[PDB]
Amino acid sequence: ILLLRAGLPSHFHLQLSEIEFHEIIGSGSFGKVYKGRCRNKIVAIKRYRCSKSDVDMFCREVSILCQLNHPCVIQFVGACLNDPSQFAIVTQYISGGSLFSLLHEQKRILDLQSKLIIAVDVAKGMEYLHNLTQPIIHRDLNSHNILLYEDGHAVVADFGEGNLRWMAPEVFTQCTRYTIKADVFSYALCLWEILTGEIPFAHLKPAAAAADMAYHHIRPPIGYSIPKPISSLLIRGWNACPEGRPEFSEVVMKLEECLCNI
Numbered sequence: 001i002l003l004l005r006a007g008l009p010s011h012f013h014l015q016l017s018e019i020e021f022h023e024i025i026g027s028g029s030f031g032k033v034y035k036g037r038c039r040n041k042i043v044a045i046k047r048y049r050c051s052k053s054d055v056d057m058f059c060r061e062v063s064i065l066c067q068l069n070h071p072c073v074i075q076f077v078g079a080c081l082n083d084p085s086q087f088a089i090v091t092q093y094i095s096g097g098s099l100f101s102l103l104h105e106q107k108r109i110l111d112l113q114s115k116l117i118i119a120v121d122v123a124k125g126m127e128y129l130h131n132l133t134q135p136i137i138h139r140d141l142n143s144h145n146i147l148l149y150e151d152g153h154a155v156v157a158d159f160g161e162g163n164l165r166w167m168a169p170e171v172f173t174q175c176t177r178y179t180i181k182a183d184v185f186s187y188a189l190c191l192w193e194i195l196t197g198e199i200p201f202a203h204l205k206p207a208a209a210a211a212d213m214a215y216h217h218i219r220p221p222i223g224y225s226i227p228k229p230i231s232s233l234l235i236r237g238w239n240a241c242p243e244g245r246p247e248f249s250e251v252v253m254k255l256e257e258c259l260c261n262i
């Protein structure tokens with residue numbers, strides 16, 4: 001736990017007094033999320049409620065955050081590490097809100113170019129996460145975990161919320177580590193959500209949607225209106241065979257090629 005304190009770079013250490021708290025932004029099992037001011041920046045402070053389960057998770061997040069340096073991934077400001085009562089995580093505050101709010105709450109209509117910029121930014125950030133010397137599976141990529149600047153660029157974050165031959169496929173899957181290709185499945189649903197401005201399987205509650213995708217092989221409808229290079233990314237992206245899904249390098253390259261024509 002203090003192993004983190006030694007391992008963390010100097011400028012990232014923060015004192016609890018150096019952090020000004022203004023409003024609450026969200027709640028979790030980890031604690032509350034504040035909007036505040038710290039180091040002359042408007043920041044977001046992830047504050048924690050000191051028993052083993054939650055602490056192992058605290059070090060994990062900090063360990064992840066001091067490694068991230070990319071314009072399409074959330075920025076770490078630093079963390080407070082004096083006592084467990086004062087454990088906190090400080091990041092940039094991206095003021096434009098979540099992609100979810102933009103699409104489903106504010107219900108805004110977007111330009112195709114507007115849509116493609118967000119998509120590419122998410123793709124760029126994920127390629128970044130997947131090309132770390134120790135690659136990171138996001139595991140929870142969705143429109144709530146994608147934040148937007150006021151200028152419409154976006155940032156990828158995480159709110160912290162036998163013999164095989166006769167085995168059942170749902171039993172086989174629990175013996176198989178999921179890989180980064182799991183993030184490609186998730187991205188593709190988000191990309192469909194951007195293009196259509198619709199929540200995936202909007203008519204269903206989440207667990208029903210998940211089983212329809214897994215057990216009954218339903219995907220969202222790919223209309224004909226959807227651009228040739230994109231719709232291809234979708235089909236392959238949400239393929240049931242993980243290996244059959246593209247790398248982000250390809251998504252980025254193809255989505256960027258589209259920007260040049262819009």
Ligand SMILES: CNC(=O)c1cc(Oc2ccc(NC(=O)Nc3cccc(C(F)(F)F)c3)cc2)ccn1
Nearest residue numbers: 025044046064074092093094095097156157158159
């Ligand atoms: C209107 N703006 C906001 O309400 C708002 C809220 C806001 O809260 C947050 C605070 C901290 C985090 N911490 C985070 O992503 N940690 C992380 C952990 C593992 C992996 C990743 C990765 F990036 F790799 F996915 C990230 C997120 C959100 C931030 C900005 N703005």
